[PDB]
């Protein structure tokens, strides 16, 4: 994912260092002698160093959309940049490259020498890399990877955010942190999607489903209160930094409320089925409403959101209307059942 | 970004160039263009028509030497293109005009068209990454190391004085007359004719320049020496003849201090200095009189500095320390100053990029002319 391009040197210099390598002598700067203070020689040297500066700048200033790809991709991308910039420092610190720099310094040409460290943004890139270097090492995303139980997710979410708490000392950006949070919610949603897949939730009783329901809201509340603690955390961070009055968007619509709202509609849905199926058992309206009940509800189909609204808003209010029309008789029937006497 | 800045010091008589950071200009040759006069008959002759540099100097008899620049103003741009192109040839630089930003010296008070068309020439035919036109006095003071003082130069076609205060070259005190080295040689040619010796060929005017460079001096007393008969030293031509000069050797560079001999209402060099100093802030006159720097090849005559001191003392107010410096690199003052200026990190922000020139145009050059 990161281009690591070597720095090519002029071949004659390699032959000179090769001649010194046959002996074991350190290839000196004045080995060229008269060739040092010549025009075409220094001309080609600056050409090579100039292309080196472009090779360094090719990857140091590189940047992509912080929300592009999944969470692990962006996090791993920052890690890749850290080790890659260290490899650029490795190519910078070799004695052969330093030998070329010594040629340009000994030849009184300060341009490529000073620009080799200033024009290259490697120094500032490495210092920002080092500022984010402990923050990127030992990231507990694997705690979120193999977490299928909601309790594991509760403790995992709190653990990851407490490890992320070290962004008060490393200047974390605003929008970067918000896209980071949405990436965290992306993986949370993915894990929950397969969790609902391996749950077979459309066949269990309301006891187990109630426990799973409460556990889902447990995870959601860990998200809300700990996210507000992270909010206050970033609030005091922006206060201690004292930079400006930007229009920072905190109107975050993450990847988990999308399922949370559907859950809420199902809560009141189970209230209808709770009062009915829990009592109705107590003339065929009993059976008939369970008949029409299951008949308009047995096809949730992996309960995704898109088809959820797309067809289930009609099938949903249609289930309500099937109760109603089915349950329409009982009202006036009750008016019969007891008003006659 | 590019390789290294190339300091090309122009001059109406001698162009001087090299890379920045260099100690002395490695490439210097006369600013003329010689094309043959005779007829190509025998095969295997000197191929090519236009000659510049050492080859044009060597076979001097065949050429019909002309100058493309006079009084710091370019008269022919084609010959200047060939001269600059020659600077980038294999005989002088062996480089390309695409990887080198260019520092360009230029005389003050010149027309805008010089900077404009010269910029077009560089950024279009040469396509240099960055061009930077500058003064010449500023560079000479940078070459001496000090910072505030006037600069008195007299090259081959121009002569001027610039009172520089810490780098800000005061633009309201730059006196400039057009009587320099080449014109002194021209007047010397007239006096040689009056002696009896005739030199009128274009490739013989150069011999007149050689005589000016090695047989003239400056009399301390301008009139007392004219009322005497000198020893009349001889001179050996390249031909092998002999010329006895006589009085035509001290009156020839006398022109610089009195352009009445050429018939002109201009002023001498001393008056250019005194007017350049007096047309400045009264609070800086003593500092300027204590710091005068000479540059340019016409300041190499014998008895030049001494006569300049006498003249300035006659024009400066009483009991004011006058001090004229005269470094050993008056021919290379502007070039060495260019080597010091262009070798700095601020030069990156001081030039004009090619992109900028393509965006705004010549107005960008006049905008960032300093
Ligand atoms: N020894 C000398 N004595 C007098 N004049 C000289 C001597 N050497 C050179 N010159 C004149 O000085 C001129 C050099 O000045 P130049 O370097 O051309 O200034 P610029 O380069 O700014 O035009 C030459 O034209 C030459 O005629």
XYZ file of C-alpha atoms and ligand atoms in Angstrom:
738
model
C 0.000 0.000 0.000
C 2.979 2.387 0.190
C 5.572 3.009 -2.532
C 9.106 2.526 -1.216
C 11.389 3.886 -3.947
C 15.170 3.647 -3.667
C 17.494 6.553 -4.362
C 19.678 5.981 -7.442
C 23.236 7.294 -7.503
C 25.442 7.993 -10.523
C 27.165 4.824 -11.788
C 30.703 6.237 -11.825
C 30.446 7.003 -8.131
C 29.403 3.411 -7.606
C 32.474 2.272 -9.528
C 34.651 4.472 -7.314
C 33.100 3.099 -4.139
C 33.468 -0.353 -5.691
C 37.197 0.283 -6.153
C 37.418 1.306 -2.528
C 35.327 -1.736 -1.597
C 37.896 -4.022 -3.227
C 40.406 -2.648 -0.695
C 38.246 -1.947 2.344
C 38.938 1.768 2.385
C 36.221 4.289 3.103
C 35.472 6.089 -0.174
C 36.617 9.617 0.518
C 35.088 12.788 -0.878
C 38.272 13.958 -2.585
C 38.667 10.615 -4.368
C 37.448 12.341 -7.526
C 40.075 15.062 -7.058
C 39.757 17.460 -9.964
C 36.395 15.908 -10.840
C 34.887 17.428 -7.663
C 35.084 21.089 -8.699
C 33.808 20.622 -12.265
C 30.562 21.873 -13.820
C 28.997 18.809 -15.459
C 29.871 16.593 -12.518
C 28.104 18.738 -9.924
C 25.349 19.277 -12.485
C 24.595 15.559 -12.628
C 24.901 15.302 -8.847
C 22.234 17.939 -8.324
C 20.072 16.203 -10.919
C 20.151 12.995 -8.925
C 19.549 14.724 -5.598
C 16.683 16.691 -7.100
C 15.005 13.503 -8.280
C 15.587 12.091 -4.789
C 13.704 15.022 -3.290
C 10.824 14.343 -5.631
C 10.878 10.634 -4.670
C 10.653 11.510 -0.976
C 7.901 14.070 -1.515
C 6.042 11.505 -3.629
C 5.055 9.594 -0.498
C 5.518 12.003 2.414
C 2.696 14.350 1.513
C 0.416 11.451 0.475
C -3.065 11.445 1.992
C -6.431 9.795 1.375
C -9.975 10.193 2.678
C -9.993 9.207 6.382
C -13.296 7.316 5.990
C -12.284 5.618 2.732
C -12.281 1.899 3.346
C -13.000 0.186 6.612
C -11.675 1.169 10.034
C -8.811 -1.316 10.031
C -7.733 -0.108 6.594
C -7.320 3.523 7.672
C -5.682 2.595 10.981
C -3.323 0.207 9.228
C -2.674 2.924 6.647
C -1.345 5.280 9.296
C 0.802 2.410 10.612
C 2.155 1.753 7.126
C 3.049 5.408 6.771
C 4.959 5.294 10.057
C 7.209 2.375 9.162
C 7.520 3.554 5.548
C 8.740 6.997 6.557
C 11.274 5.284 8.779
C 12.441 3.345 5.711
C 12.815 6.645 3.876
C 14.989 7.793 6.760
C 16.961 4.581 6.296
C 17.616 5.388 2.660
C 18.531 8.930 3.708
C 21.114 7.855 6.273
C 23.171 5.602 4.029
C 26.856 6.568 3.624
C 26.580 6.550 -0.159
C 23.875 9.188 -0.173
C 25.878 11.076 2.424
C 28.878 10.779 0.107
C 26.923 12.533 -2.635
C 25.925 15.184 -0.123
C 29.571 15.576 0.822
C 30.384 16.059 -2.843
C 27.906 18.893 -3.112
C 29.070 20.405 0.181
C 32.767 20.159 -0.656
C 31.997 21.678 -4.042
C 30.496 24.752 -2.323
C 26.983 23.952 -3.620
C 24.753 24.414 -0.557
C 21.458 24.254 -2.499
C 20.894 20.523 -2.778
C 22.437 19.965 0.645
C 20.129 22.267 2.568
C 17.163 21.313 0.410
C 17.836 17.610 1.083
C 16.489 18.162 4.580
C 14.341 21.266 4.230
C 12.733 20.848 0.804
C 12.020 17.244 1.699
C 9.089 17.162 4.098
C 10.506 14.001 5.610
C 11.542 15.717 8.840
C 8.118 17.084 9.667
C 6.511 13.915 8.393
C 8.660 11.834 10.720
C 7.948 14.073 13.698
C 4.186 13.830 13.166
C 4.643 10.095 12.619
C 6.470 9.868 15.912
C 3.695 11.874 17.546
C 1.189 9.269 16.360
C 3.589 6.329 16.695
C 2.591 5.028 20.183
C -1.031 5.768 19.356
C -0.892 3.409 16.408
C 1.013 0.580 18.066
C -0.976 -1.963 20.128
C -4.440 -0.999 18.999
C -7.181 -3.219 20.545
C -9.241 -3.674 17.395
C -8.863 -7.454 17.682
C -10.941 -7.171 20.874
C -13.688 -6.011 18.515
C -12.874 -8.616 15.866
C -13.738 -11.899 17.612
C -16.430 -10.393 19.826
C -19.793 -12.040 19.150
C -21.200 -11.724 22.657
C -22.579 -8.300 23.463
C -20.817 -8.330 26.853
C -17.485 -8.845 25.081
C -18.457 -5.895 22.904
C -19.321 -3.789 25.995
C -15.958 -4.328 27.637
C -14.249 -4.114 24.233
C -15.797 -0.744 23.415
C -14.779 0.677 26.779
C -11.267 -0.764 26.415
C -10.689 0.655 22.922
C -11.865 4.093 23.944
C -9.764 4.130 27.096
C -6.746 3.257 24.965
C -7.749 6.013 22.553
C -7.785 8.459 25.503
C -4.095 9.308 24.731
C -5.131 11.695 21.945
C -5.163 14.585 24.413
C -1.378 14.737 24.242
C -0.968 13.993 20.516
C -3.174 16.740 18.911
C -5.889 14.788 17.359
C -7.914 16.546 14.634
C -11.639 17.100 14.912
C -13.062 15.795 11.631
C -10.494 13.005 11.657
C -11.759 11.849 15.026
C -15.360 12.048 13.853
C -14.691 9.942 10.779
C -12.750 7.646 13.091
C -15.801 7.288 15.315
C -17.979 6.522 12.316
C -15.456 3.907 11.217
C -15.668 2.349 14.666
C -19.435 2.298 14.295
C -18.997 0.726 10.836
C -17.208 -2.275 12.253
C -19.682 -2.342 15.154
C -22.491 -2.592 12.636
C -20.710 -5.316 10.652
C -20.148 -7.407 13.774
C -23.796 -6.917 14.807
C -24.955 -7.889 11.305
C -23.289 -11.277 11.511
C -24.355 -11.516 15.189
C -27.990 -11.216 14.115
C -27.210 -13.743 11.389
C -25.862 -16.401 13.789
C -28.621 -15.658 16.350
C -31.651 -17.213 14.523
C -33.583 -14.478 16.375
C -36.780 -14.979 14.343
C -37.581 -18.255 16.094
C -36.628 -17.868 19.782
C -39.057 -17.124 22.616
C -39.499 -13.684 24.128
C -37.426 -14.726 27.170
C -34.190 -15.303 25.244
C -35.069 -12.559 22.757
C -35.713 -10.225 25.671
C -32.292 -11.011 27.130
C -30.646 -10.436 23.740
C -32.679 -7.225 23.362
C -31.495 -5.888 26.723
C -27.899 -6.832 25.831
C -28.213 -4.872 22.574
C -29.352 -1.800 24.481
C -26.491 -2.439 26.951
C -23.985 -2.073 24.115
C -25.808 0.997 22.809
C -25.719 2.666 26.208
C -22.023 1.940 26.576
C -21.633 3.704 23.248
C -23.705 6.728 24.270
C -22.277 7.440 27.730
C -18.687 6.599 26.851
C -19.010 8.573 23.649
C -20.202 11.549 25.657
C -17.141 11.089 27.845
C -15.055 11.139 24.671
C -17.011 14.224 23.582
C -16.147 16.085 26.807
C -12.607 14.758 26.363
C -12.280 16.391 22.938
C -14.054 19.506 24.241
C -11.356 20.110 26.845
C -8.725 19.173 24.235
C -9.900 21.947 21.922
C -9.987 24.250 24.954
C -6.406 23.456 25.974
C -5.188 23.927 22.426
C -6.877 27.348 21.788
C -6.881 27.459 17.995
C -10.117 28.923 16.464
C -13.952 28.812 16.275
C -14.509 26.343 13.431
C -18.007 25.067 12.526
C -17.151 21.491 13.743
C -19.995 19.069 13.080
C -20.998 16.939 16.036
C -24.281 15.912 14.310
C -22.995 12.375 13.920
C -25.275 9.756 12.392
C -23.251 6.572 12.955
C -23.768 3.065 11.625
C -25.680 1.693 14.613
C -28.696 3.980 15.009
C -29.830 2.584 11.642
C -30.638 -0.678 13.380
C -31.535 0.852 16.737
C -34.636 2.606 15.334
C -35.922 -0.631 13.796
C -35.451 -2.265 17.199
C -37.628 0.430 18.807
C -40.444 -0.134 16.330
C -40.169 -3.821 17.134
C -40.429 -3.004 20.871
C -43.865 -1.459 20.459
C -44.656 -4.232 17.961
C -44.017 -6.777 20.690
C -46.210 -4.698 22.986
C -49.122 -5.330 20.647
C -48.246 -9.006 20.469
C -47.562 -9.101 24.188
C -50.986 -7.927 25.322
C -52.660 -9.964 22.597
C -50.783 -13.315 22.521
C -50.205 -13.139 26.233
C -53.948 -12.809 26.979
C -56.104 -13.643 23.844
C -55.639 -17.358 24.631
C -58.419 -16.820 27.147
C -64.810 -16.836 19.352
C -62.079 -17.739 16.890
C -60.529 -14.236 17.168
C -57.858 -15.810 19.446
C -56.628 -18.233 16.830
C -57.430 -15.940 13.891
C -55.347 -13.066 15.168
C -52.423 -15.394 15.753
C -53.097 -16.738 12.252
C -53.114 -13.327 10.574
C -50.332 -12.301 12.997
C -47.807 -14.777 11.762
C -49.202 -14.560 8.211
C -48.284 -10.900 7.847
C -45.033 -11.176 9.872
C -43.155 -14.366 8.898
C -40.950 -12.799 6.088
C -38.519 -10.289 7.694
C -35.678 -11.703 5.523
C -32.358 -11.032 7.337
C -34.021 -7.723 8.469
C -31.930 -5.293 6.428
C -32.934 -1.645 6.472
C -33.363 -0.935 2.718
C -36.032 -3.537 1.987
C -37.263 -2.907 5.559
C -38.701 0.449 4.633
C -39.081 -0.396 0.879
C -41.707 -3.069 1.437
C -42.075 -3.525 5.152
C -43.498 -0.028 5.802
C -46.512 -1.204 3.811
C -46.302 -4.748 5.229
C -45.776 -3.235 8.706
C -48.804 -0.951 8.745
C -50.449 -3.811 6.879
C -49.797 -6.004 9.834
C -51.333 -3.316 12.056
C -54.378 -3.192 9.759
C -54.594 -6.977 9.712
C -54.849 -6.986 13.516
C -57.341 -4.155 13.367
C -59.635 -5.534 10.689
C -59.245 -8.963 12.279
C -59.710 -7.392 15.720
C -62.457 -5.088 14.436
C -65.157 -7.658 15.215
C -64.324 -8.024 18.911
C -65.119 -4.414 19.807
C -68.686 -4.467 18.492
C -68.725 -8.172 19.321
C -67.962 -7.262 22.937
C -70.766 -4.755 22.579
C -72.911 -7.782 21.739
C -71.319 -10.233 24.273
C -72.199 -7.942 27.159
C -74.671 -5.277 25.975
C -77.547 -7.677 25.395
C -77.886 -8.673 29.045
C 13.175 23.226 -8.483
C 16.222 22.979 -10.751
C 19.916 22.205 -10.518
C 21.771 25.386 -9.729
C 21.420 29.046 -10.605
C 23.561 30.323 -13.434
C 24.802 33.846 -12.944
C 25.127 35.354 -16.400
C 26.610 38.784 -16.055
C 25.919 40.720 -19.173
C 27.881 43.688 -20.283
C 27.913 45.651 -23.456
C 31.496 44.641 -24.017
C 32.286 41.487 -22.049
C 29.762 38.922 -20.989
C 30.682 36.879 -17.915
C 28.990 33.740 -16.698
C 29.162 30.686 -14.506
C 27.210 28.815 -11.911
C 26.280 30.343 -8.608
C 28.461 29.490 -5.709
C 31.523 29.581 -7.936
C 34.434 31.631 -6.752
C 35.419 33.450 -9.965
C 33.540 33.425 -13.294
C 34.988 30.553 -15.247
C 33.478 31.668 -18.559
C 34.215 35.189 -19.772
C 34.490 36.400 -23.352
C 33.713 39.537 -25.370
C 30.128 40.428 -26.128
C 30.456 40.666 -29.884
C 29.418 38.602 -32.851
C 31.768 38.030 -35.738
C 30.705 36.694 -39.094
C 33.127 36.396 -42.012
C 33.725 39.158 -44.497
C 35.627 37.361 -47.233
C 34.542 34.627 -49.643
C 34.545 30.916 -48.924
C 36.525 29.414 -51.762
C 38.642 26.506 -50.686
C 36.802 23.544 -49.268
C 37.623 22.476 -45.766
C 37.433 26.091 -44.652
C 36.130 27.340 -41.326
C 32.696 25.843 -41.365
C 29.831 27.765 -39.896
C 29.176 31.450 -40.260
C 28.632 33.163 -36.926
C 31.547 32.871 -34.504
C 31.544 33.884 -30.821
C 34.085 33.437 -28.061
C 37.650 32.263 -28.449
C 37.211 31.095 -32.026
C 35.927 34.472 -33.067
C 38.817 36.070 -31.287
C 41.410 33.785 -32.856
C 40.481 34.194 -36.498
C 39.907 37.877 -35.980
C 40.969 38.942 -39.458
C 38.111 37.226 -41.257
C 35.315 38.521 -39.102
C 33.281 41.697 -39.290
C 32.727 42.027 -35.548
C 29.647 43.898 -34.382
C 28.066 44.452 -31.056
C 24.483 43.548 -30.299
C 24.336 45.565 -27.113
C 25.292 49.181 -26.758
C 24.925 51.432 -23.716
C 23.419 48.524 -21.829
C 20.604 48.299 -24.360
C 20.237 45.425 -26.759
C 20.077 46.562 -30.364
C 19.872 43.128 -32.025
C 18.132 40.293 -30.298
C 19.168 37.612 -32.745
C 22.832 38.095 -32.000
C 22.021 38.147 -28.316
C 20.156 34.881 -28.657
C 23.146 33.365 -30.337
C 25.419 34.737 -27.631
C 23.316 33.340 -24.818
C 22.929 30.120 -26.754
C 26.694 30.088 -27.057
C 26.933 30.472 -23.307
C 24.945 27.296 -23.002
C 27.014 25.512 -25.646
C 29.526 22.753 -25.159
C 32.346 25.233 -25.160
C 31.213 27.180 -22.108
C 28.633 25.446 -19.932
C 27.746 22.088 -21.566
C 24.339 22.268 -19.881
C 20.711 22.761 -20.772
C 18.672 25.893 -20.258
C 15.851 23.878 -18.714
C 17.367 22.928 -15.382
C 18.899 26.147 -14.259
C 17.344 29.264 -12.784
C 19.013 32.364 -14.149
C 20.359 35.378 -12.337
C 20.753 38.203 -14.790
C 22.633 41.398 -14.179
C 21.273 44.506 -15.826
C 22.127 48.212 -15.752
C 19.775 50.769 -14.178
C 17.414 53.156 -15.911
C 17.147 50.900 -18.923
C 13.945 50.594 -20.952
C 11.255 48.223 -19.840
C 11.487 46.429 -23.163
C 14.914 45.083 -22.209
C 13.557 43.205 -19.239
C 10.420 42.248 -21.121
C 11.979 40.885 -24.294
C 14.931 39.432 -22.412
C 12.488 37.607 -20.228
C 10.654 36.342 -23.279
C 13.929 35.117 -24.723
C 14.839 33.190 -21.586
C 11.458 31.800 -20.591
C 10.487 30.973 -24.159
C 13.445 29.970 -26.266
C 15.487 28.838 -23.334
C 12.540 27.935 -21.084
C 14.528 28.509 -17.929
C 12.778 27.526 -14.695
C 13.341 30.887 -13.054
C 14.633 34.247 -14.171
C 15.727 37.100 -11.966
C 16.822 40.441 -13.354
C 18.668 42.665 -10.932
C 20.798 45.757 -10.675
C 24.542 45.741 -10.827
C 25.566 48.058 -8.041
C 23.704 45.995 -5.473
C 25.680 43.006 -6.577
C 28.997 44.824 -6.423
C 28.391 45.922 -2.860
C 27.374 42.403 -1.976
C 30.650 41.267 -3.448
C 32.667 43.566 -1.239
C 30.808 42.465 1.857
C 29.931 45.889 3.241
C 26.430 47.153 2.925
C 25.870 50.915 2.742
C 27.755 52.996 0.221
C 27.656 54.258 -3.302
C 28.870 52.179 -6.206
C 30.668 53.802 -9.072
C 30.829 51.619 -12.118
C 31.879 52.206 -15.682
C 31.653 49.153 -17.819
C 31.831 49.137 -21.547
C 28.718 51.019 -22.491
C 27.279 52.550 -19.338
C 28.415 54.272 -16.208
C 26.379 55.153 -13.173
C 26.441 55.686 -9.458
C 23.958 54.129 -7.057
C 23.742 55.099 -3.414
C 22.861 51.855 -1.677
C 21.582 51.900 1.886
C 21.615 48.416 3.435
C 20.489 46.869 0.145
C 17.685 49.277 -0.643
C 19.216 50.855 -3.715
C 17.856 54.414 -3.545
C 16.109 54.824 -6.889
C 16.032 58.597 -6.655
C 19.772 59.107 -6.681
C 20.977 56.939 -9.574
C 22.735 59.294 -11.934
C 23.583 57.639 -15.225
C 25.545 58.810 -18.234
C 26.394 56.793 -21.313
C 30.126 57.397 -21.605
C 31.992 54.216 -20.917
C 34.921 52.072 -22.044
C 33.826 51.440 -25.601
C 33.174 55.103 -26.151
C 36.561 55.960 -24.704
C 38.030 53.557 -27.218
C 36.055 55.233 -29.957
C 37.358 58.638 -29.019
C 40.805 57.097 -28.823
C 40.344 55.925 -32.383
C 39.583 59.479 -33.404
C 42.715 60.697 -31.697
C 44.762 57.984 -33.338
C 43.533 59.233 -36.688
C 44.598 62.721 -35.682
C 47.981 61.253 -34.863
C 48.205 59.883 -38.383
C 47.629 56.225 -37.709
C 44.349 55.046 -39.169
C 42.285 52.208 -37.738
C 38.798 51.946 -39.072
C 38.084 48.297 -39.714
C 35.609 46.642 -37.385
C 38.197 44.007 -36.579
C 40.704 46.792 -36.000
C 38.575 48.696 -33.529
C 39.459 45.804 -31.270
C 43.108 46.698 -31.681
C 42.147 50.168 -30.570
C 40.608 48.561 -27.489
C 43.820 46.681 -26.880
C 45.720 49.941 -27.017
C 43.302 51.463 -24.537
C 43.807 48.516 -22.244
C 47.591 48.609 -22.215
C 48.884 52.031 -23.217
C 46.680 54.694 -21.631
C 46.824 56.363 -18.255
C 45.208 59.262 -16.433
C 47.080 62.467 -15.859
C 46.778 63.937 -12.407
C 46.901 67.480 -13.628
C 44.709 67.512 -16.726
C 46.206 70.604 -18.275
C 49.782 70.798 -16.983
C 50.555 67.499 -18.655
C 48.914 68.599 -21.891
C 51.322 71.544 -22.109
C 54.315 69.193 -22.234
C 55.753 66.736 -24.715
C 55.763 63.221 -23.277
C 58.290 60.501 -24.000
C 55.966 59.124 -26.766
C 56.215 55.431 -26.048
C 55.833 52.966 -28.893
C 53.344 50.179 -29.390
C 53.627 46.869 -31.214
C 50.669 45.904 -33.332
C 49.684 42.277 -33.924
C 50.893 42.890 -37.435
C 54.330 43.796 -36.133
C 54.355 47.509 -36.922
C 55.094 50.315 -34.487
C 52.913 53.194 -33.335
C 54.188 56.119 -31.337
C 51.228 57.526 -29.442
C 52.301 60.700 -27.720
C 49.557 62.925 -26.327
C 46.860 60.579 -27.516
C 47.189 58.377 -24.474
C 46.178 60.589 -21.592
C 43.626 62.729 -23.356
C 41.888 59.573 -24.502
C 40.574 58.497 -21.086
C 40.112 62.148 -20.173
C 36.709 61.832 -21.816
C 35.301 60.203 -18.696
C 35.869 63.346 -16.701
C 34.818 65.787 -19.338
C 32.410 64.775 -22.069
C 32.882 68.070 -23.783
C 35.597 66.532 -25.846
C 33.013 64.297 -27.436
C 30.683 67.282 -27.529
C 28.024 66.404 -24.993
C 26.248 68.176 -22.139
C 26.675 65.179 -19.830
C 28.910 65.164 -16.783
C 32.126 63.554 -15.721
C 32.416 60.599 -13.455
C 33.163 62.809 -10.464
C 30.030 64.796 -11.067
C 28.033 61.607 -11.291
C 29.290 60.614 -7.862
C 28.780 63.996 -6.279
C 25.333 64.379 -7.752
C 24.406 60.869 -6.722
C 25.469 61.596 -3.196
C 23.939 65.050 -2.976
C 20.599 63.898 -4.340
C 20.078 61.814 -1.235
C 19.220 62.289 2.382
C 21.517 64.821 4.027
C 21.831 62.439 6.997
C 23.682 59.894 4.864
C 26.184 62.019 2.966
C 29.071 61.399 5.335
C 28.422 57.677 5.322
C 28.336 57.638 1.545
C 31.520 59.657 1.271
C 33.217 57.233 3.555
C 32.208 54.284 1.357
C 32.792 54.454 -2.398
C 33.321 51.249 -4.349
C 34.589 51.093 -7.912
C 33.745 48.353 -10.370
C 33.682 47.836 -14.056
C 36.595 47.550 -16.387
C 36.902 51.228 -17.153
C 38.103 51.825 -13.607
C 41.368 50.112 -14.371
C 43.300 52.973 -15.910
C 46.493 54.082 -14.271
C 45.936 56.995 -11.986
C 42.189 56.546 -12.080
C 41.456 56.347 -8.379
C 43.898 59.093 -7.524
C 42.379 61.471 -10.014
C 38.926 60.530 -8.804
C 39.951 61.457 -5.275
C 41.254 64.806 -6.420
C 38.101 65.541 -8.376
C 35.755 64.517 -5.577
C 37.731 66.618 -3.079
C 37.208 69.543 -5.357
C 33.474 68.879 -5.315
C 32.784 67.558 -1.824
C 32.331 69.959 1.104
C 35.365 70.772 3.180
C 36.624 68.354 5.824
C 34.496 65.337 5.048
C 36.408 62.078 4.892
C 36.277 60.839 1.340
C 37.106 57.190 0.875
C 37.277 55.359 -2.432
C 37.768 51.659 -2.316
C 38.992 49.727 -5.338
C 38.971 45.958 -5.017
C 40.953 43.645 -7.222
C 37.898 42.185 -8.859
C 36.369 45.188 -10.534
C 35.909 43.116 -13.654
C 34.280 40.378 -11.637
C 32.473 42.465 -9.031
C 28.991 42.049 -10.435
C 29.551 38.396 -11.122
C 30.897 37.607 -7.667
C 28.007 39.506 -6.200
C 25.721 37.396 -8.265
C 27.405 34.293 -6.947
C 26.834 35.405 -3.388
C 23.247 36.533 -3.934
C 21.988 33.563 -5.910
C 23.597 31.055 -3.583
C 21.245 31.954 -0.740
C 18.090 30.248 0.369
C 16.110 33.454 -0.004
C 16.812 33.408 -3.724
C 14.087 30.777 -4.061
C 11.600 33.403 -2.985
C 13.386 36.151 -4.796
C 13.141 34.842 -8.363
C 10.194 34.689 -10.732
C 8.949 31.242 -11.504
C 8.158 30.112 -15.021
C 4.596 29.351 -13.977
C 4.213 32.874 -12.664
C 5.521 34.308 -15.896
C 3.033 32.259 -17.842
C 0.253 33.442 -15.565
C 0.746 37.184 -15.299
C 3.362 37.989 -17.927
C 5.877 40.810 -18.100
C 3.947 42.718 -15.447
C 4.993 40.049 -12.972
C 8.602 40.881 -13.711
C 8.101 44.601 -13.259
C 6.180 43.810 -10.101
C 8.918 41.664 -8.588
C 11.757 43.599 -10.215
C 13.503 43.810 -6.824
N 43.041 47.538 -18.223
C 42.014 48.262 -18.695
N 42.074 49.587 -18.750
C 41.050 50.300 -19.203
N 39.919 49.771 -19.661
C 39.734 48.461 -19.655
C 40.797 47.614 -19.162
N 40.371 46.364 -19.267
C 39.131 46.413 -19.785
N 38.764 47.666 -20.019
C 37.482 48.089 -20.564
O 36.468 47.799 -19.621
C 35.389 47.083 -20.192
C 34.945 45.971 -19.255
O 33.788 46.355 -18.544
P 32.659 45.267 -18.555
O 33.155 44.104 -17.770
O 32.190 45.180 -19.961
O 31.518 45.946 -17.727
P 30.095 45.336 -18.014
O 30.456 43.889 -18.089
O 29.244 45.736 -16.830
O 29.750 45.929 -19.348
C 35.917 46.550 -21.495
O 35.048 47.021 -22.508
C 37.226 47.220 -21.742
O 37.055 48.090 -22.844
